[PDB]
Symmetry: C2
Subunit: 57 residues, 2 copies
Protein backbone atom coordinates (compact mmCIF):
# COMPACT_ATOMS: atom_id res chain seq x y z
CA UNK A 1 0.00 0.00 0.00
CA UNK A 2 2.92 2.37 0.67
CA UNK A 3 4.25 1.86 -2.86
CA UNK A 4 0.73 2.48 -4.18
CA UNK A 5 0.56 5.73 -2.21
CA UNK A 6 3.89 6.88 -3.64
CA UNK A 7 2.65 6.24 -7.18
CA UNK A 8 -0.57 8.16 -6.52
CA UNK A 9 1.40 11.10 -5.12
CA UNK A 10 3.71 11.33 -8.12
CA UNK A 11 0.80 11.13 -10.57
CA UNK A 12 -0.99 13.95 -8.73
CA UNK A 13 2.18 16.07 -8.76
CA UNK A 14 2.62 15.66 -12.51
CA UNK A 15 -1.02 16.52 -13.17
CA UNK A 16 -0.79 19.67 -11.04
CA UNK A 17 2.37 20.77 -12.86
CA UNK A 18 0.70 20.41 -16.24
CA UNK A 19 -2.33 22.31 -14.91
CA UNK A 20 -0.13 25.21 -13.79
CA UNK A 21 1.60 25.37 -17.18
CA UNK A 22 -1.74 25.44 -19.00
CA UNK A 23 -2.93 28.23 -16.70
CA UNK A 24 0.12 30.33 -17.57
CA UNK A 25 -0.35 29.75 -21.30
CA UNK A 26 -4.03 30.70 -21.20
CA UNK A 27 -3.22 33.86 -19.24
CA UNK A 28 -0.64 34.97 -21.80
CA UNK A 29 -2.82 34.30 -24.84
CA UNK A 30 -5.86 36.00 -23.29
CA UNK A 31 -3.77 39.10 -22.59
CA UNK A 32 -2.69 39.07 -26.23
CA UNK A 33 -6.33 38.85 -27.34
CA UNK A 34 -7.33 41.81 -25.15
CA UNK A 35 -4.49 43.96 -26.51
CA UNK A 36 -5.30 43.09 -30.12
CA UNK A 37 -8.99 43.89 -29.61
CA UNK A 38 -8.14 47.33 -28.24
CA UNK A 39 -5.84 47.91 -31.21
CA UNK A 40 -8.59 46.87 -33.65
CA UNK A 41 -11.07 49.33 -32.12
CA UNK A 42 -8.54 52.16 -32.39
CA UNK A 43 -7.83 51.11 -35.98
CA UNK A 44 -11.51 51.31 -36.96
CA UNK A 45 -11.67 54.82 -35.52
CA UNK A 46 -8.49 55.81 -37.38
CA UNK A 47 -9.88 54.40 -40.64
CA UNK A 48 -13.04 56.50 -40.34
CA UNK A 49 -10.92 59.58 -39.61
CA UNK A 50 -8.73 58.89 -42.65
CA UNK A 51 -11.74 58.56 -44.95
CA UNK A 52 -13.08 61.88 -43.67
CA UNK A 53 -9.68 63.47 -44.35
CA UNK A 54 -9.69 62.05 -47.88
CA UNK A 55 -13.10 63.56 -48.59
CA UNK A 56 -12.30 67.02 -47.23
CA UNK A 57 -8.93 67.25 -48.98
CA UNK B 1 -1.71 4.74 4.61
CA UNK B 2 -4.66 3.28 2.68
CA UNK B 3 -6.84 6.32 3.40
CA UNK B 4 -4.05 8.68 2.34
CA UNK B 5 -3.51 6.75 -0.91
CA UNK B 6 -7.21 6.94 -1.77
CA UNK B 7 -7.29 10.70 -1.17
CA UNK B 8 -4.15 11.22 -3.28
CA UNK B 9 -5.59 9.30 -6.23
CA UNK B 10 -8.83 11.31 -6.06
CA UNK B 11 -6.77 14.52 -6.09
CA UNK B 12 -4.90 13.29 -9.18
CA UNK B 13 -8.17 12.59 -11.00
CA UNK B 14 -9.46 16.08 -10.22
CA UNK B 15 -6.23 17.64 -11.48
CA UNK B 16 -6.46 15.66 -14.73
CA UNK B 17 -9.99 16.94 -15.33
CA UNK B 18 -8.84 20.51 -14.74
CA UNK B 19 -5.96 20.00 -17.19
CA UNK B 20 -8.34 18.79 -19.91
CA UNK B 21 -10.56 21.84 -19.47
CA UNK B 22 -7.51 24.12 -19.62
CA UNK B 23 -6.41 22.49 -22.88
CA UNK B 24 -9.82 23.22 -24.40
CA UNK B 25 -9.67 26.86 -23.31
CA UNK B 26 -6.15 27.30 -24.67
CA UNK B 27 -7.03 25.97 -28.11
CA UNK B 28 -10.14 28.14 -28.36
CA UNK B 29 -8.30 31.32 -27.39
CA UNK B 30 -5.47 30.49 -29.80
CA UNK B 31 -7.93 30.28 -32.69
CA UNK B 32 -9.52 33.59 -31.71
CA UNK B 33 -6.10 35.26 -31.52
CA UNK B 34 -5.19 34.06 -35.02
CA UNK B 35 -8.45 35.44 -36.41
CA UNK B 36 -7.85 38.83 -34.82
CA UNK B 37 -4.25 38.88 -36.12
CA UNK B 38 -5.58 38.49 -39.65
CA UNK B 39 -8.10 41.27 -38.99
CA UNK B 40 -5.33 43.58 -37.78
CA UNK B 41 -3.28 42.84 -40.90
CA UNK B 42 -6.26 43.93 -43.01
CA UNK B 43 -6.45 47.10 -40.89
CA UNK B 44 -2.78 47.76 -41.62
CA UNK B 45 -3.26 47.42 -45.37
CA UNK B 46 -6.24 49.80 -45.29
CA UNK B 47 -4.18 52.36 -43.37
CA UNK B 48 -1.32 52.10 -45.87
CA UNK B 49 -3.63 52.80 -48.81
CA UNK B 50 -5.31 55.72 -47.02
CA UNK B 51 -1.93 57.25 -46.15
CA UNK B 52 -0.78 57.03 -49.77
CA UNK B 53 -3.96 58.69 -51.03
CA UNK B 54 -3.63 61.44 -48.40
CA UNK B 55 -0.09 62.16 -49.58
CA UNK B 56 -1.21 62.37 -53.21
CA UNK B 57 -4.08 64.74 -52.38
Amino acid sequence: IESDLERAEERAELSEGKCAELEEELKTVTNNLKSLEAQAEKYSQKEDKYEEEIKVL
